[PDB]
Amino acid sequence: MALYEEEIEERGKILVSLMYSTQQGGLIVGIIRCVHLAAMDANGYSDPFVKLWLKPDKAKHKTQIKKKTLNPEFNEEFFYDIKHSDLAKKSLDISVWDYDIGKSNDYIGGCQLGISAKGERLKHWYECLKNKDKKIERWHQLQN
């Protein structure tokens, strides 16, 4: 609306699955859900959606927009055609956004999963690289 209705350390957590499928020849990325997202509207909620970019590259995907929730349930899967060893060249940028109708979308937070990450985000990538045809599901902290 017109009276700033669509306008914080804890940004939320995201549950992500990674599976390299040898039958299909590529990476399946699952965006399952987020929990305790930052509220980026005055009603105390957000309208979240998630964007994926497989860097450095078809490289991009996005989820649907869920309305008025800090705990969006997406259960959506995305596919990238890629050789397994070429995943060792890439990193997946994940960003979470609050859709607004009358202004720019608000940034909730993000995380990078891939070779230029650190800590548990790096390890998640490595577990997918080391384990073909296993679904590796982990929770990550969103960062600003």
Q: Which of 38, 98, 108, 117 binds Ca ion (CB under 5 A)?
A: 98
For residue 53, the minimal CB distance to Ca ion (Å) is 22
The verdict on 100 binding Ca ion (CB under 5 A) reads: yes
Please name which of 37, 96, 39 lies closest in space to residue 64, comparing C-alpha atoms. 96
What residues have CB less than 8 Å from 76, skipping those under 6 apart?
30, 31, 63, 64
Nearer to Ca ion, 26 or 72 (CB): 72
For residue 6, the minimal CB distance to Ca ion (Å) is 4
In the window 4-23, what residues touch Ca ion (CB under 5 A)? 6
For residue 44, the minimal CB distance to Ca ion (Å) is 11
The verdict on 93 binding Ca ion (CB under 5 A) reads: no
> How is residue 86 written in tokens?
């070429």
Listing DSSP states for the chain in one string gives --SSTT------EEEEEEEEETTTTEEEEEEEEEESPPP-STTS---EEEEEEEET---EEEPPPPPS-SS-EEEEEEEEE--GGGGGG-EEEEEEEE--SSSPPEEEEEEEEETT--HHHHHHHHHHHH-TT--EEEEEE-B-
Q: Which of 47, 97, 112, 125 binds Ca ion (CB under 5 A)?
A: 47
The verdict on 106 binding Ca ion (CB under 5 A) reads: yes
The verdict on 72 binding Ca ion (CB under 5 A) reads: no
133 is in an annotated binding site: no
Q: How many residues bind Ca ion (CB under 5 A)?
A: 7
From the annotation, which residues make up the binding site for Ca(2+)?
Answer: 6, 41, 47, 98-100, 106
- Site residues for Ca ion per CB under 5 A: 6, 40-41, 47, 98, 100, 106
